[PDB]
Amino acid sequence: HMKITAINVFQVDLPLREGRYSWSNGNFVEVFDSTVVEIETDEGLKGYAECCPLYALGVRSGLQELAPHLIGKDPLNIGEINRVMDAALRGHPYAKAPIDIACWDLLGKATGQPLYTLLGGAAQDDVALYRAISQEAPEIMAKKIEGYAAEGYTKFQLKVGGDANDDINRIHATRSVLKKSDLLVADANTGWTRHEAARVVGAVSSLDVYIEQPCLTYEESVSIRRRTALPFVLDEVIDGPNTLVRGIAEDAMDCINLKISKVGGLTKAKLMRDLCIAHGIPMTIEDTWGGDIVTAAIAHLARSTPSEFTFSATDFNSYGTVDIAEGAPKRVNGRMTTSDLPGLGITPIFDVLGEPVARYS
Asked whether position 190 contacts Mg ion by CB under 5 A, the answer is: no
Q: How far is the CB of 351 from a second copy (least distance, A)?
A: 30
Question: Which lies closer to a second copy via its Cβ, residue 127 or residue 324?
Answer: 127
Question: Which lies closer to Mg ion via its Cβ, residue 27 or residue 77?
Answer: 27
137 binds, among Cl ion, a second copy, Mg ion, none (CB under 5 to 8 A by kind): Cl ion
The verdict on whether 330 is a catalytic residue reads: no
First CA to last CA distance, the chain: 18
Residues near Cl ion (CB under 5 A) are: 45-46, 132, 137
Q: How far is the CB of 314 from Cl ion (least distance, A)?
A: 6
Q: How far is the CB of 257 from Mg ion (least distance, A)?
A: 4
Question: Which lies closer to Cl ion via its Cβ, residue 264 or residue 290?
Answer: 290
Question: Which lies closer to a second copy via its Cβ, residue 40 or residue 100?
Answer: 100
The verdict on whether 143 is a catalytic residue reads: no
- Residues within window 28-87 making contact with Mg ion, judged by CB under 5 A: none
- Paired sense of beta strands 232-234 and 255-259, if any: parallel
201 binds, among a second copy, Cl ion, Mg ion, none (CB under 5 to 8 A by kind): a second copy
Q: How far is the CB of 100 from a second copy (least distance, A)?
A: 11
Residue 316 contacts residue 295 (beta carbons within 8 Å): yes
Residue 64 contacts residue 358 (beta carbons within 8 Å): yes
185 binds, among a second copy, Cl ion, Mg ion, none (CB under 5 to 8 A by kind): none
152 binds, among Mg ion, Cl ion, a second copy, none (CB under 5 to 8 A by kind): none
Amino acid at 127: V
Q: Which of 46, 96, 155, 259 is catalytic?
A: 259
Question: Which lies closer to a second copy via its Cβ, residue 8 or residue 221?
Answer: 221
132 binds, among Cl ion, a second copy, Mg ion, none (CB under 5 to 8 A by kind): Cl ion
Q: How far is the CB of 17 from a second copy (least distance, A)?
A: 28
Q: Which of 46, 96, 109, 159 is catalytic?
A: 159
Q: How far, in Å, are 4, 5, 6, 318 from residue 47 at the CA level?
A: 10, 12, 11, 23
Q: 125 labelled as ligand-binding? A: no
What is the 3 state secondary structure string of the chain? CCCEEEEEEEEEEEEECCCCEECHHHCEECEEEEEEEEEEECCCCEEEEEECCCCHHHHHHHHHCCHHHCCCCCCCCHHHHHHHHHHHCCCCHHHHHHHHHHHHHHHHHHHCCEHHHHCCCCCCCCEEEEEEECCCCHHHHHHHHHHHHHHCCCEEEEECCCCHHHHHHHHHHHHHHCCCCCEEEEECCCCCCHHHHHHHHHHCCCCCCEEECCCCCHHHHHHHHCCCCCCEEECCCCCCHHHHHHHHHCCCCCEEEEECCCCCCHHHHHHHHHHHHHCCCCEEEECCCCCHHHHHHHHHHHHCCCHHHEEEECCHHHHECCCCEECCCEEECCEEECCCCCECCCEECHHHHCCCCEEEC
The Cα–Cα gap between 206 and 191 comes to: 22
191 binds, among Mg ion, Cl ion, a second copy, none (CB under 5 to 8 A by kind): Mg ion
Q: 212 labelled as ligand-binding? A: yes
Q: 239 labelled as ligand-binding? A: no
The Cα–Cα gap between 287 and 295 comes to: 8
Site track 236-275 with Mg ion (rule: CB under 5 A), x = hit: ---------------------x------------------
Question: Which lies closer to Mg ion via its Cβ, residue 4 or residue 188?
Answer: 188
Site track 148-187 with Mg ion (rule: CB under 5 A), x = hit: ---------------------------------------x
Single out the segment in contact with Mg ion by CB under 5 A; choices: 71-79, 112-120, 165-173, 230-238: 230-238
Annotated binding site for Mg(2+): 187, 212, 235
Active centre residues (catalytic): 159, 259
Annotated binding site: 187, 212, 235
